[PDB]
Amino acid sequence: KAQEESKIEDVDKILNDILSISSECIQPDELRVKLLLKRKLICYDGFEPSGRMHIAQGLLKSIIVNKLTSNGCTFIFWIADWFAHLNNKMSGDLKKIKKVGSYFIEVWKSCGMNMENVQFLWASEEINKKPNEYWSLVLDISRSFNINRMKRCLKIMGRSEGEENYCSQILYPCMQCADIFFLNVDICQLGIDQRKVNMLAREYCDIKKIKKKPVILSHGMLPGLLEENSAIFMDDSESDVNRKIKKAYCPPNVIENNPIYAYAKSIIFPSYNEFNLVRKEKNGGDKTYYTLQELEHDYVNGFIHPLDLKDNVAMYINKLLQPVRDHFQNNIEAKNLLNEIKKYKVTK
Amino acid sequence: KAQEESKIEDVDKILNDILSISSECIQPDELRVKLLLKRKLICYDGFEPSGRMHIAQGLLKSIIVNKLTSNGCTFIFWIADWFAHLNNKMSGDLKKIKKVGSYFIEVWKSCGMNMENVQFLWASEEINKKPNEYWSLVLDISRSFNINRMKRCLKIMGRSEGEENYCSQILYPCMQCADIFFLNVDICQLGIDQRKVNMLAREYCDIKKIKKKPVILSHGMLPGLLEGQENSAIFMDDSESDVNRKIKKAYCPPNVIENNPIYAYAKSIIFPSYNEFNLVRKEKNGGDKTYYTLQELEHDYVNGFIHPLDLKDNVAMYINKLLQPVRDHFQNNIEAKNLLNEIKKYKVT
Ligand SMILES: CC(C)c1nn([C@@H]2O[C@H](COS(=O)(=O)NC(=O)[C@@H](N)Cc3ccc(O)cc3)[C@@H](O)[C@H]2O)c2ncnc(N)c12
Ligand SMILES: CC(C)c1nn([C@@H]2O[C@H](COS(=O)(=O)NC(=O)[C@@H](N)Cc3ccc(O)cc3)[C@@H](O)[C@H]2O)c2ncnc(N)c12
Ligand SMILES: [Cl-]
Ligand SMILES: [Cl-]
Ligand code: NA
Ligand code: NA
Ligand code: NA
Ligand code: NA
């Protein structure tokens, strides 16, 4: 027959693709086993509703999510409303956190996630449907690890250790760890800045002799726009994008920590399977890049000047944000929601 | 007009009465104010179902609760089953913890308390009836205090600082603090070893601008039977000979009251149980005598008018009389006898 061989090849391809969009996988052979389970894998990422959405959580997220769901997975977006509250976001105000969460969902559905295999789940709603199960997990995790081990998860709250260490910094990682089991996740697909608590979950499996362990499929962090005006938001207008890109950090010849180059490589190139650099002839002229290898060689050797990369990145970000811009300009309810949340003060 | 004066006098009597069963009150002025509210005050104590019941948690508790419920209070016994589990009691085993909690309730119902204003509430059951309210309190408390402040509450878990500090030692005090608000308590009536988390609740009110603050009415810790404190305390299932053997060997310094745990039993359990202490002695040792005030009893023993061994002999027989109706419940009620049999087989962790 040879169908067996064809299925092995199919699995190898799905595995190479799933691994492609990741900066790290813990562990690849485990991911291969999960796939042979012959079933939809559950992936998830989670989000504090803390203010307008940075393009990392919309444009970049949509690329990874569509890759995974098109390869048979279901993807949960965990709107971590209680976590934002625990982390002092939006003045702790749950009404504001809820409005922001609603705005997140509007963004995601207009930026490539209006689809059957993506679920938008609210942490508070889901915890309160099964609160004995949820909080019993949280308490059992807290019994298994000492305070220092848990303090090492502080990066998941976006915090440095030099500040005051509130007890919330213990509860939050216990709860994020519980989420991984509570949602029956196969793949934790969060930014690499979440790795500590994802590793904690794997350690908890070993402690409890739980053989079903989650695969950590972490994506890379987009560097900050600068080395409000500090990030591109998913709702930004064309002039807002143009202005923020013009002033962004884009060191000549340097890719490390370069946000402009990161947008080209991680958002724009996968979206178009190319990068078209429009330039005057005296600056090298237009050029179409078909590989990231050439783009990197050309930027590192100075063939691409920062101003040219910036102009092209701005044009592409505006093209990619068009359906979001249009949704929030033309849909009256979404326009009114954005107008409300834009007035909120951003806290921590 | 004569009614106004009489209302004041009544409150003063009730205040001094409630305060008598306490070793510390934070604060008496606040308790007076609570007493003027013209509604029942909610009091509570909570208990990890962890093994045998200490005589302090059965006989002494019933003396205190009877005082409070006859003085305008309602009293909650909080069966802290999830806390026992969090604190690694009974192998963490929630089935054993539930069995032991059932046994505690059986004991308390035979301990001589007026039950019309007493409730037995299970932590897990009540929390899961209102889990959004409860866990939102827990998280807000955790946002309000730093880790070091919460580590200083470790005594409430019966643990020493030299050991490994599991994160459960942070969740537990946040949760005990939450209980105080979740149950809408007016008076936290626990042992003085719970003071840190009770102080935490008060501080939390100040932080949140909550003017309704709980009064901490702490009772004293009953000392261990041996000098400087199994054989270190009476438990609620102990037999008459168990009591006799443990009291007989207890520390009872002749002519000295301080740290004499026998005297601690006379003063905190027996005297409030009988509104007196009737000291039986042979005529050659002074003959029987009734002390009607603790000042009187203390005066006679500190000056050597009371033989230590006479205090032991009576403390033991009075403790035996007091445990009799629990013994009877567990001999004659068949389901109770078997519950006690099962829970005595548990390994204490
Ligand atoms: C803009 C910056 C903040 C950023 N975030 N992310 C990624 O977005 C996601 C959200 O982030 S978050 O809202 O801050 N939430 C958190 O941290 C979590 N604890 C919330 C949570 C998660 C799971 C739970 O079970 C419970 C709670 C993460 O996967 C970040 O790793 C990026 N990815 C690439 N480049 C970037 N610059 C960024
Ligand atoms: C056994 C001995 C040490 C002792 N205990 N108690 C007193 O009994 C009670 C139980 O104690 S416990 O079962 O250990 N539970 C705990 O500690 C709590 N954290 C459980 C809890 C409570 C309220 C909550 O909202 C949540 C959880 C306390 O009031 C002790 O203070 C004594 N009173 C006088 N003399 C004594 N020798 C003793
Ligand atoms: Cl449940
Ligand atoms: Cl509720
Ligand atoms: Na969907
Ligand atoms: Na974060
Ligand atoms: Na050109
Ligand atoms: Na204790």
Author numbering:
A (entry chain B): 17 to 243, 253 to 373
B (entry chain A): 17 to 245, 253 to 372
Text of the article:
The Plasmodium falciparum cytoplasmic tyrosine tRNA synthetase (PfTyrRS) is an attractive drug target that is susceptible to reaction-hijacking by AMP-mimicking nucleoside sulfamates. PfTyrRS is a Class I aaRS, characterized by a catalytic domain with a Rossmann fold (residues 18–260) linked to a C-terminal anti-codon binding domain (residues 261–370) involved in recognition of tRNATyr. PfTyrRS contains “HIGH” and “KMSKS” (70HIAQ74 and 247KMSKS251 in PfTyrRS) motifs that are characteristic of the catalytic domain of Class I tRNA synthetases (sub-class c). ML901 binds the P. falciparum cytoplasmic tyrosine tRNA synthetase (PfTyrRS), and then reacts with the bound activated amino acid, resulting in the synthesis of an inhibitory sulfamate-amino acid adduct within the active site of the enzyme.
